[PDB]
C-alpha cells in the first residue's frame, strides 16, 4: 500500500515521479488525504526542505516525508531505495536537523496536541481554516468552530489560534469573551514541524484588559 | 490539473 503527493517540485520533476510511481506501481495524487502514505519534498543535498501545507500534513499524519532524491537516486540505481535513507531531516525555518518527520512516524501513540481543544479563530491566509483544523486533529486536538462552545470541562484544555496579520484590531479582545490562551498560528506550525508541543510563552498574543 | 504554486511558510 502506497500513495504519494509531491511538494515543491517543477512540472518536469513531477513527471519523473509519475514515471517512477508507474514503474513501481505507486498511486500518485495532487491532494494529500488519509490514504496518503508518502510526501516527497523538494530538498537540498542535506535533505532540508521548505515548509508547505503538505509538509505539515505529512508530518501530522505521521507519514513518510522523504527527499525527492529518493526518486532520482532510485531511478539511477534502478530499484526502490529505502525511505529511511532519504527522510527529511529538517527545514529552512525550524532547523536543518530537527528530525520532525522521523519523530512523528514513531510517535503516533503519544500525539502532541492530545487533551487540547483548539479554535481556529478569525481570518487566515494561504491556508484555509479547514486544513488548519484538520492538521491539529491529526495531532490529536478537538476542533471548536466558535469561541462560546469551548468545553467548560476539566477533561479538555482550550487554546485559541489566530493569524493577526490576516486581521484588519479585535484579536486583542478575545480574552474578554473567554479565558483560554490566545497564541499565533506559528505556535501550531512550529509545534508540528518539531513534532513537540511548544511552550506558549513566545507565541502568546497580549490581550486588552 | 495539479498545483505548483504552493505557498511557503517562512515565518515573516
Curated annotation (Swiss-Prot), chain A:
Consequence the record notes for mutating residue 122 to V: In BC; pathogenic; functionally impaired in vitro
Impact reported for residue 127 to R: In BC; pathogenic; alters protein stability and abolishes ACACA and BRIP1 binding
Compartments reported by the entry: Nucleus; Chromosome; Cytoplasm
Outcome, altering residue 91 to G: In BC; uncertain significance; functionally impaired in vitro
Result of altering residue 37 to I: In BROVCA1; pathogenic
Result of altering residue 42 to Q: In some patients with sporadic breast cancer; uncertain significance
Impact after mutating residue 185 to P: Mildly reduces affinity for a BRIP1 phosphopeptide
Listed result of changing residue 18 to A: Does not abolish ABRAXAS1 binding, but impairs formation of a heterotetramer with ABRAXAS1
Effect of residue 127 to K: In BC; pathogenic; strongly reduced transcription transactivation; abolishes interaction with BRIP1 and RBBP8
Pathology noted in the entry: Breast cancer: A common malignancy originating from breast epithelial tissue. Breast neoplasms can be distinguished by their histologic pattern. Invasive ductal carcinoma is by far the most common type. Breast cancer is etiologically and genetically heterogeneous. Important genetic factors have been indicated by familial occurrence and bilateral involvement. Mutations at more than one locus can be involved in different families or even in the same case. Breast-ovarian cancer, familial, 1: A condition associated with familial predisposition to cancer of the breast and ovaries. Characteristic features in affected families are an early age of onset of breast cancer (often before age 50), increased chance of bilateral cancers (cancer that develop in both breasts, or both ovaries, independently), frequent occurrence of breast cancer among men, increased incidence of tumors of other specific organs, such as the prostate.
Subunit structure, as described in the record: Heterodimer with BARD1. Part of the BRCA1-associated genome surveillance complex (BASC), which contains BRCA1, MSH2, MSH6, MLH1, ATM, BLM, PMS2 and the MRE11-RAD50-NBN protein (MRN) complex. This association could be a dynamic process changing throughout the cell cycle and within subnuclear domains. Component of the BRCA1-A complex, at least composed of BRCA1, BARD1, UIMC1/RAP80, ABRAXAS1, BRCC3/BRCC36, BABAM2 and BABAM1/NBA1. Interacts (via the BRCT domains) with ABRAXAS1 (phosphorylated form); this is important for recruitment to sites of DNA damage.
Protein name (record): Breast cancer type 1 susceptibility protein
Gene: BRCA1
First-to-last residue of the parent protein present: 1649 to 1859 of 1863
Amino acid at each position: 500500500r502506497m500513495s504519494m503527493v509531491v511538494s515543491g517540485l517543477t512540472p518536469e520533476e513531477f513527471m519523473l515521479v509519475y514515471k517512477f510511481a508507474r514503474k513501481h506501481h505507486i498511486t500518485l495524487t495532487n491532494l494529500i488525504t488519509e490514504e496518503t502514505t508518502h510526501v516527497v519534498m523538494k530538498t537540498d543535498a542535506e535533505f532540508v526542505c521548505e515548509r508547505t501545507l503538505k509538509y505539515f500534513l505529512g508530518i501530522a499524519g505521521g507519514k513518510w516525508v522523504v527527499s525527492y532524491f529518493w526518486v532520482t537516486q532510485s531511478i539511477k540505481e534502478r530499484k526502490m531505495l529505502n525511505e529511511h535513507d532519504f527522510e527529511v531531516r529538517g527545514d529552512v525555518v525550524n532547523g536543518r536537523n530537527h528530525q520532525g518527520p522521523k519523530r512523528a512516524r514513531e510517535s503516533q501513540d503519544r500525539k502532541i496536541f492530545r487533551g487540547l481543544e483548539i479554535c481556529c479563530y478569525g481570518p487566515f491566509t494561504n491556508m484555509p481554516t479547514d486544513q488548519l483544523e484538520w492538521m491539529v486533529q491529526l495531532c490529536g486536538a478537538s476542533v471548536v468552530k466558535e469561541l462560546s462552545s469551548f468545553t467548560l470541562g476539566t477533561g479538555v484544555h482550550p487554546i485559541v489560534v489566530v493569524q493577526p496579520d490576516a486581521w484588519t484590531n479585535g484579536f486583542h479582545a478575545i480574552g474578554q469573551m473567554c479565558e483560554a490562551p490566545v497564541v499565533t498560528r506559528e505556535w501550531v506550525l512550529d509545534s508540528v514541524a518539531l513534532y513537540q508541543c511548544q511552550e506558549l510563552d513566545t507565541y502568546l498574543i497580549p490581550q486588552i484588559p | 490539473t495539479i498545483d505548483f504554486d504552493e505557498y511557503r511558510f517562512r515565518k515573516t
